[PDB]
Amino acid sequence: DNTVRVGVSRNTSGAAGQTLFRNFYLLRCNILADGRNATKAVQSHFPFLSRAVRCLSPLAAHCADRTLRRDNVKQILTRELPFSSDLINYAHHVNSSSLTTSQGVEAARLVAQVYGEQVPFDHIYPTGSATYCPGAIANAISRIMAGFVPREGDDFAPSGPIDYLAADLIAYKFVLPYMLDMVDGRPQIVLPSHTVEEMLTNTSLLNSIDASFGIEARSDQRMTRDAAEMSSRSLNELEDHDQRGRMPWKIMLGMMAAQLKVELDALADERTESQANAHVTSFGSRLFNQMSAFVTIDHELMELALLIKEQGFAMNPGQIASKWSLIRRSGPTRPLSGARLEIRNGNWMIREGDQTLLSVSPARMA
Amino acid sequence: AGQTLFRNFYLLRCNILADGRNATKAVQSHFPFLSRAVRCLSPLAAHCADRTLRRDNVKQILTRELPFSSDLINYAHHVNSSSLTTSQGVEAARLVAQVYGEQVPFDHIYPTGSATYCPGAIANAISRIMAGFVPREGDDFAPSGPIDYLAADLIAYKFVLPYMLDMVDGRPQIVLPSHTVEEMLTNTSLLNSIDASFGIEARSDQRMTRDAAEMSSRSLNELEDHDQRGRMPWKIMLGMMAAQLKVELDALADERTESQANAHVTSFGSRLFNQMSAFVTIDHELMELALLIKEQGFAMNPGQIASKWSLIRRSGPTRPLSGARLEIRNGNWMIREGDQTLLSVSPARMA
Amino acid sequence: ASFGIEARSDQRMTRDAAEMSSRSLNELEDHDQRGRMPWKIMLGMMAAQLKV
Amino acid sequence: RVGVSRNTSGAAGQTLFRNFYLLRCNILADGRNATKAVQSHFPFLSRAVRCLSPLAAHCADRTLRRDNVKQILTRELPFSSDLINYAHHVNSSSLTTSQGVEAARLVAQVYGEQVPFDHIYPTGSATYCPGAIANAISRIMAGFVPREGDDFAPSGPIDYLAADLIAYKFVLPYMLDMVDGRPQIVLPSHTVEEMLTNTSLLNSIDASFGIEARSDQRMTRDAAEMSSRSLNELEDHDQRGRMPWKIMLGMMAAQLKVELDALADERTESQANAHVTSFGSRLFNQMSAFVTIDHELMELALLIKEQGFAMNPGQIASKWSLIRRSGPTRPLSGARLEIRNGNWMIREGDQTLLSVSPARMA
């Protein structure tokens, strides 16, 4: 006669787990015990880094948030103990030294100038301050590209104009960012010479960055003769337009890489956490996969990836933090002159003679 | 392989494959451009791929001695054939041309003030403008226009279920369609009675159903109003597709010779009924045709469709449905009388 | 009362269409053999036992 | 301009053996293997083996999955895969057989008070679809009521055995004949078709049911036998349908055998996917329930084990045809069966020729 229907739990609680580096944004980690299998090598996952690489197509990533996810974001942001992860998630600036950096603030000022006219940008990038959070700027410049407009203390509002590139990136799923140079008087993909912060300081260098976008068609046997050449476009090939946010996209990529590098530097000070979680050997293996978008851009990240692949993806947090600090202090550590660059089957790989030192596949803009 | 039937039609340009094994004429049927019509309800997702890819010239078609309408309807050009065009609800073309105004060369889409128009071209123009294109006078589209707020919102969804609303017992309530789509076009203010929910394609375990998401107040009407968020153009395009289907069914009814010379395709109506499931909840006549096909038990043929459609159009409401009732059950629209299910349709696929 | 499944394995997702995959006691089809009234009586009886 | 377009992808999916009932399988490559590490699984066969606990299998469908089935059951060319799942007779010679029709007639006589005849079993028909009969008896045991061209109506009475089997997760069929004056497990003496032809022999067949206890991390002691129970050990009652349960098991086995025989005609399809050597591996993995009841399934399992637990569908079809034509290809008198650690296996002294473990049903 009278009926009201209510839900029930999707219980899978047997897979107990916990999180590492809760005060970090990208290097925040979730570790899960092997449930389906008996082995005990704890598998791990960096959620926010996955989200960041997904957000390279801002509209596809943020469309679901336009309608139904009007949560109690005010309580989260107005909470007396805010988390840097949440604040950076909603593009709110944070003053933490570990999260913030001073190098390459010129790009941040450029972004604020471009978008500050039609958006309240003081809370994203306070004017004049040298220190800034690249993650917050990346989140802001993705959200604004996806038609949102920030509300400085509460949430975003889906009311702003939508960028042309954010719409063009709905037809693509796979992205391969890579450096480019005018060697031989001809465009050629080259190894990443400059670091991210150098480009952020001198924004003119960003014009060298390039990326290729690819579809996810529903037929097997790609590369028939070549599927990419009529199923894939390059970022710099798109027609110029004032509303088309190319430089914002490049700055978003660079800022995200800068945030990754900053958090890797700050990781060296988490001695207690690294020591306590030395048993998680999947940290290096997971990071080697999730980082793959940024390897082709930054020198130090590429060298870290090479070092990771050398010793079989076994590093715990401290074992990789120490190596990162070593390479940061000592600059270059190995000679890449013998190594050479090669592209085949849509993969960006480094060859030393016959051996492939490193090989990365395009990430997925889910 | 296969063959195309009713080549001059647009939605009923059925593709036929002789994949059956009961007999040589045991043929599987598919309707090209009808899938496209129902797909274009999410214009951005439908047209995102074309934003950076090949373009073709329609000017060659105008010089053809006997040009084929389908390309013109695809690219929103006014075909002059009386079978495809119609005059009922032409004020809808006038008002949409006015609201989009001179920002687009809309004369090629709809002649100024004419009492004749082709609904397919109007709907195609609405969809592609809403996606962020702008037709040129050279009969090709440019992606340089601004992008609608609503079109960028349908990316998050893949299923749609239109339905009419009425203020029954002083509260909003789903009701049977009490109007016809041409009347909706004429009475533009009446379109506000239309509403639609959107789905998300949940997972399955030997289950072919799909999730329609919020059955509560999260339908199209609940979206916050804005200058760019064109709900009304979307409803216009939906009604325009419905009118196109109705007038093409009328044209098929007039195609007595072809229908009776090809009255052997028993899968024709069976495919058509499921392919048009979106429009049953909007129109008297489409509902009546669907109910007659279902009670007939499918296996319907073109000539029988022609005869039945002519009867329905000439006789007005053929049957009374006051004894039946309408219920939305598990994300499905179903017409039930007593305990039996007179008719049922699941949400269509936007993309 | 509202009944629902302990859905398939899934490590994070909080719902499996929780409203679609659940049913209520008063919504089940009626039949003489169904002890709906005995079931509700049993529930109330257990509650009364706890209270006493 | 600078740069050039480089990469794309073509991820998709596929399946195979659509026309078959149990031999339908999902061809999918390994997610972690970029190469053509093809994988196969049998949904229909898994459902069939799981159905041995009828109430456990059909509990959800009693309220939840009430769907529109009339459209499915009213196609110009309806697929036998789901039509047999809803237990409707079909004329497919490749999916029907005449042997054991007396068992179908016996089931019809047993349940005629509720089941309409012609939609489930046309009276006097030489051939019949044993899979449809198995599905129907399972659903009847669950409490459902069939309707021609319509979804089952959950209104029939519950079978006592269906209620009992909900507590047990693991099953293990086997055959027995009198030896030494005491009952003892024996290798099969007749084929499933010969079994169904002479229903009186069905007292020979038996199965043992076992619980699943994930609560304790401790291994299984001798108490595993204390927990378990056997089909004929249960208290006798009119509504407790041991005989229909045995008929269901035999009918499902016969359906598998006849469709395996029909599989011999898929030369083109089988050779088109000869790369999938794991087909036979998956077949043997999911076939532990029925091998212990028939000669020829035992022969096929022994051949697959000897052949390395890996062969393509064409190899399976050809070798099964060879088994069917030859009959008993080996004298198994040398080997002996054992119940070592619960599993059902046969050994030629020390070496084990074939090993089987209890199947999970609920």
Query: Are the CB atoms for B31 and B12 separated by under 8 Å?
Result: yes
Report the DSSP beta bridge partners of residue B344: B334
For residue C49, give how far its alpha carbon lies from the nearest alpha carbon of chain A (Å): 27
- For the record, the structure tokens of A329 come out as 């202090």
In total, chain D counts a number of residues equal to: 362
Contact between chains at A5 and C26 (C-beta distance less than 8 A): no
For A219-224, the CB contacts below 8 A with 24+ separation are: A219/D10, A219/D12, A220/D10, A220/D12, A220/D14, A221/D10, A222/D8, A222/D9, A222/D10, A223/A345, A223/A346
Q: Report chain C residues whose CB lies below 8 A from the CB of B203.
A: 16
Q: Please spell the DSSP secondary structure of A75-142, one letter per residue.
A: HHHHSSS--HHHHHHTT-----TTT-B-TTHHHHHHHHHHHHTSS--TTTS-SS-S-B-HHHHHHHHH
Closest residue on chain B to A59 (Cα): B152
- The 10 Å CB-count burial string (b at 16+, else e) for B220-244 is bbebeeeebbbbbbbbbbbbbbbbb
Give which of D232, D188, D228, D181 is closest to D206, Cα–Cα.
Answer: D232
Q: Is D110 exposed, middle or buried (0-12, 13-18, 19+ CB in 10 A)?
A: middle
Q: Report chain D residues whose CB lies below 8 A from the CB of B298.
A: 71, 74
For residue D88, give how far its alpha carbon lies from the nearest alpha carbon of chain B (Å): 19
Q: Please spell the DSSP secondary structure of A101-112, one letter per residue.
A: B-TTHHHHHHHH
HEC states along A11-54? CCCCCCEEEECCCCCCCCEEEECCCCCCCCCCEEECHHHHHHHH
Q: What are chain D's partners, defined as 3 or more CB pairs within 8 angstroms? A: A, B, C
- Residue tagged 């080996």 (tokens): D330
Q: What are chain B's partners, defined as 3 or more CB pairs within 8 angstroms? A: A, C, D
Query: Are the CB atoms for B348 and B277 separated by under 8 Å?
Result: yes
- Residue tagged 């839900």 (tokens): A7
Which of D43, D68, D76 shows the shortest C-beta gap to B20?
A: D76
Give which of B274, B266, B296 is closest to B345, Cα–Cα.
Answer: B274
- Bin D220: left if φ > 0, else alpha if -120 < ψ < 50, else beta: beta
Give which of B88, A312, B133 is closest to B109, Cα–Cα.
Answer: B133
Residue A219 CB neighbour total at 10 angstroms: 10
Q: Report chain A residues whose CB lies below 8 A from the CB of C23.
A: 5
Contact between chains at C23 and D155 (C-beta distance less than 8 A): no
Q: Which residues contact D38 (CB under 8 A, 6 or more apart)?
A: D27, D28, D29, D30, D273, D275, D276, D278
Distance of CA B224 to the CA centre of its chain: 25
Name the DSSP class of A145.
T
- Distance between CA A169 and CA D253 in Å, rounded? 53
N-term to C-term CA, chain D:
63
User: Radius of gyration over alpha carbons of chain B, in Å?
Assistant: 20
Q: Which of C9, C15, C19, C20 to mutate to test the interface with B (most CBs of B within 10 A)?
A: C20
For residue A345, give how far its alpha carbon lies from the nearest alpha carbon of chain D (Å): 7
- Distance between CA B233 and CA B229 in Å, rounded? 9
Q: Report chain C residues whose CB lies below 8 A from the CB of B211.
A: 17, 20
HEC states along chain D? CCCCCCCCECCCCCCECCCCCCCCECCEECCCCCCCCEECCCHHHHHHHHCCCHHHHHCHHHCCCCCCCCCHHHCCCCCHHHHHHCCCCCCCHHHCECCCHHHHHHHHHHHCCCCCHHHHCCCCCCCECHHHHHHHHHHHHHCCCCECCECCCCCCCCCHHHHHHCCCCEEEEEEECCECCECCEECCCCCHHHHHHCHHHHHCEEEEEECCCCCCCCCCCCHHHHHCEEHHHCCCCCCCCHHHHHHHHHHHHHHHHHHHHHHHHCHHHHHHCCCCCHHHHHHHHHCCCCHHHCHHHHHHHHHHHHCCCCCCHHHHHHHHHHHHHHCCCCCCCCCEEECHHHCEEEEECCEEEEEECCEECC
- Distance between CA D59 and CA B160 in Å, rounded? 32
Q: Which of D61, D63, D65, D144 to mutate to test the interface with C (most CBs of C within 10 A)?
A: D63
- Bin A336: left if φ > 0, else alpha if -120 < ψ < 50, else beta: alpha
Resolution (A): 3.5
Residue B195 CB neighbour total at 10 angstroms: 18
Cα D358 to Cα A299, D57, D165, D221, D279: the distances in Å are: 58, 18, 15, 16, 21
- Structure determined by: cryo-EM
Closest residue on chain D to A218 (Cα): D12
Query: Are the CB atoms for B8 and B69 separated by under 8 Å?
Result: yes
Distance of CA A172 to the CA centre of its chain: 17
Name the DSSP class of B228.
S
Give which of A32, A1, A53, A7 is closest to A295, Cα–Cα.
Answer: A53
Q: Which residues contact D145 (CB under 8 A, 6 or more apart)?
A: D114, D152, D153, D154, D155, D156
Query: Are the CB atoms for D257 and D217 separated by under 8 Å?
Result: no
Contact between chains at D64 and C31 (C-beta distance less than 8 A): no
Cα A240 to Cα A112, A177, A244, A247, A354: the distances in Å are: 22, 19, 7, 11, 41
Q: Report chain A residues whose CB lies below 8 A from the CB of C2.
A: 4-8
For residue B202, give how far its alpha carbon lies from the nearest alpha carbon of chain C (Å): 8
Closest residue on chain A to D11 (Cα): A218
Q: Is B310 exposed, middle or buried (0-12, 13-18, 19+ CB in 10 A)?
A: middle
Closest residue on chain C to B200 (Cα): C17
Which of A3, A4, A10 shows the shortest C-beta gap to C7?
A: A10
Contact between chains at A164 and B155 (C-beta distance less than 8 A): no
- Distance between CA A20 and CA D53 in Å, rounded? 45
Q: Which amino acid is at A10?
A: R
Contact between chains at D77 and B21 (C-beta distance less than 8 A): yes
Q: Report chain D residues whose CB lies below 8 A from the CB of A173.
A: 9
Using a CB–CB cut-off of 8 Å, the residues of A that contact B are 59-60, 63-64, 66-68, 147, 158-159, 161-162, 164, 167-168, 170-171, 215, 233, 238, 241, 243
Closest residue on chain C to D156 (Cα): C33
Q: Which residues contact A246 (CB under 8 A, 6 or more apart)?
A: A165, A235, A236, A238
For chains A and B, CB pairs below 8 A equal: 55
Query: Are the CB atoms for B220 and B193 separated by under 8 Å?
Result: no
- For the record, the structure tokens of A282 come out as 């999947």
SS3 B58: coil
Query: Are the CB atoms for B298 and B274 separated by under 8 Å?
Result: no
- The 10 Å CB-count burial string (b at 16+, else e) for B157-167 is bbbbbbbbeee
Q: Report chain B residues whose CB lies below 8 A from the CB of D77.
A: 20-22, 26
Contact between chains at B203 and C20 (C-beta distance less than 8 A): no
- The 10 Å CB-count burial string (b at 16+, else e) for A128-143 is eeebbbbbbbbbbbbb
Q: Report chain C residues whose CB lies below 8 A from the CB of D155.
A: 31
- Distance between CA D353 and CA A142 in Å, rounded? 64
Contact between chains at B297 and D77 (C-beta distance less than 8 A): no
- Distance between CA B271 and CA D302 in Å, rounded? 49
Which of A215, A218, A236 shows the shortest C-beta gap to D2?
A: A236
Contact between chains at C10 and A15 (C-beta distance less than 8 A): no
Report the DSSP beta bridge partners of residue A44: A31
Q: Report chain A residues whose CB lies below 8 A from the CB of B145.
A: none
Q: Report chain C residues whose CB lies below 8 A from the CB of B331.
A: 20
Q: Which of B203, B208, B328 to mutate to test the interface with C (most CBs of C within 10 A)?
A: B203
Query: Are the CB atoms for A158 and A187 separated by under 8 Å?
Result: no
Closest residue on chain D to C7 (Cα): D60
- Residue tagged 């016959």 (tokens): A354
- Distance between CA B225 and CA B211 in Å, rounded? 26
Which of D8, D12, D14 shows the shortest C-beta gap to A346?
A: D8
Contact between chains at B22 and D74 (C-beta distance less than 8 A): no
Report the DSSP beta bridge partners of residue B197: B161
Closest residue on chain C to D63 (Cα): C28
- Distance between CA B340 and CA C8 in Å, rounded? 33
Residue D224 CB neighbour total at 10 angstroms: 15
For chains B and D, CB pairs below 8 A equal: 20
For residue B330, give how far its alpha carbon lies from the nearest alpha carbon of chain C (Å): 7
For residue B203, give how far its alpha carbon lies from the nearest alpha carbon of chain C (Å): 8
Query: Are the CB atoms for A348 and A360 separated by under 8 Å?
Result: yes
Q: Which of D64, D65, D144, D152 to mutate to test the interface with C (most CBs of C within 10 A)?
A: D64
Contact between chains at D7 and A176 (C-beta distance less than 8 A): yes
Give which of D69, C49, A175, D216 is closest to B344, Cα–Cα.
Answer: D69
- Distance between CA D305 and CA B276 in Å, rounded? 53
Query: Are the CB atoms for A21 and A40 separated by under 8 Å?
Result: no
Contact between chains at D63 and C28 (C-beta distance less than 8 A): yes
User: Radius of gyration over alpha carbons of chain D, in Å?
Assistant: 22
Q: Which residues contact A37 (CB under 8 A, 6 or more apart)?
A: none
Q: What are chain C's partners, defined as 3 or more CB pairs within 8 angstroms? A: A, B, D
Query: Are the CB atoms for B80 and B47 separated by under 8 Å?
Result: no
Q: Which amino acid is at B270?
A: S
User: Radius of gyration over alpha carbons of chain A, in Å?
Assistant: 21
Report the DSSP beta bridge partners of residue A176: A212
